[PDB]
């Protein structure tokens, strides 16, 4: 009975241990953006502030690198408890070690305080390599969703799918309420890409490629409405503009797929529509019967009193009303056929 609580305790520990790493990774990006934009406008006059802001990034990276190891140790403990092994030597595989070392080498890339307004190639690539730390978002979202927290959830899921794929949670979020998520994705990619393009094509002549132009160029490339008044002029700016249309076509496909589903009736709506159609059909039928009898009498009286030959249109009206009555009778018959 102790394991039934120990597993939940360690999983709850993992929840916070993976939640904190997201904040400690976002802090690094927040500081790198500030330093990059400070070196441009500030110039060479500000050096002590740059040195002080370039070391907090290194401190944050060191603090981040001490949480991935703890998370993997908790994962190893969970695996050992679930499989009942007693020695940790067999719990660790080579593939897991390779994944761990890859994570620790990806997460450890920072400009560093080692060793006038333009960034060097090495620094400009190391800073832009800090955006790879976004792979921690899916695990935090999955662990915070609660689909895996409860013991009953795990028990019921083990029958069909033992490992909860991220695609299941993605589909759940998509079908519960779209629109908000899609808008967030569209308005969070028009700001994290404009800055990258401005870094790629930042000119000191007349600010020919700063945020006053990229914020206009990116949307009209995402929506395939490319005008041609402003275009990229650097090999590193012609690749960010080919990865934006690929992310626009997929978004359009997702929007079309969502819209196709969003306009479908349910059972209650179909029942209400069928009831309204049936009552409308009955009312039209009775009105048509009244019309046909009235017009038949009118034509008969016109013939009886010999009101010249002006009663020709009366036969036309009689035939049209009769055929309309037959048509509505057939429609009501077929409707009663399918609804029964």
């Amino acid at each position: 009975l102790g394991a039934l609580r120990r597993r939940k305790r360690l999983l709850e520990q993992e929840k916070s241990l993976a939640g904190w790493a997201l904040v400690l990774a976002g802090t690094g990006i927040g500081l790198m953006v500030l330093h990059a934009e400070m070196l441009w406008f500030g110039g060479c006059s500000w050096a002590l502030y740059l040195f002080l802001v370039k070391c907090t990034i290194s401190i944050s990276t060191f603090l981040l690198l001490c949480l991935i190891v703890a998370f993997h140790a908790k994962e190893v403990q969970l695996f050992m408890t679930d499989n009942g092994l007693r020695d940790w030597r067999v719990a660790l595989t080579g593939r897991q070690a390779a994944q761990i070392v890859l994570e620790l080498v990806v997460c450890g890339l920072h400009p560093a305080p080692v060793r006038p307004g333009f960034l060097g190639q090495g620094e400009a690539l190391l800073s832009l390599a800090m955006l790879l730390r976004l792979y921690l978002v899916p695990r935090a979202v999955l662990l915070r969703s609660g689909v895996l927290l409860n013991a009953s959830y795990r028990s019921i899921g083990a029958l069909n799918q033992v490992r909860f794929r991220h695609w299941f949670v993605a589909k759940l979020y998509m079908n519960t309420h779209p629109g908000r998520l899609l808008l967030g994705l569209t308005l969070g990619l028009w700001l994290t890409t404009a800055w990258v393009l401005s870094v790629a094509e930042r000119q000191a002549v007349n600010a020919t490629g700063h945020l006053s132009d990229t914020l206009w160029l990116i949307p009209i490339t995402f929506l395939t409405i490319g005008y041609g008044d402003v275009v990229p002029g650097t090999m590193w700016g012609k690749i960010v503009c080919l990865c934006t249309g690929v992310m626009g076509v997929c978004c359009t496909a997702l929007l079309v797929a969502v819209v196709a589903r969003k306009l479908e009736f349910n059972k209650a709506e179909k029942h209400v529509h069928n009831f309204m159609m049936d009552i409308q059909y009955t009312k039209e039928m009775k009105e048509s019967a009244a019309r046909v009898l009235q017009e038949a009498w009118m034509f008969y009286k016109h013939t009886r009193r010999k009101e010249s030959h002006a009663a020709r249109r009366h036969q036309r009206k009689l035939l049209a009303a009769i055929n309309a009555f037959r048509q509505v009778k057939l429609k009501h018959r077929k409707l009663r056929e399918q609804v029964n």
Binding site: K286, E287, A289, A290, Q294, A296, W297, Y300, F325, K329
Partner: protein
């Protein structure tokens, strides 16, 4: 040159067998669409003169009307 007169009369049924009287057919006709008067009641009497009893036996007295 007509069919389903049984259902046509059963739609506006008053006596159960489609033998609605002259007043019955009169108020059926006047209720929907056009409305009329003493002229209409005399017209209903003339239409029922084929039956001569008020109970409109449409099954027999419809072929002459529809001819």
């Amino acid at each position: 040159s007509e069919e389903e007169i049984r259902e046509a009369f059963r739609v506006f049924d008053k006596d159960g067998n489609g033998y609605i009287s002259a007043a019955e057919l009169r108020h059926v006709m006047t209720n929907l669409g056009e409305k009329l008067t003493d002229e209409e009641v005399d017209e209903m009497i003339r239409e029922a003169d084929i039956d001569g009893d008020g109970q409109v036996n449409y099954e027999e007295f419809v072929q002459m009307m529809t001819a």
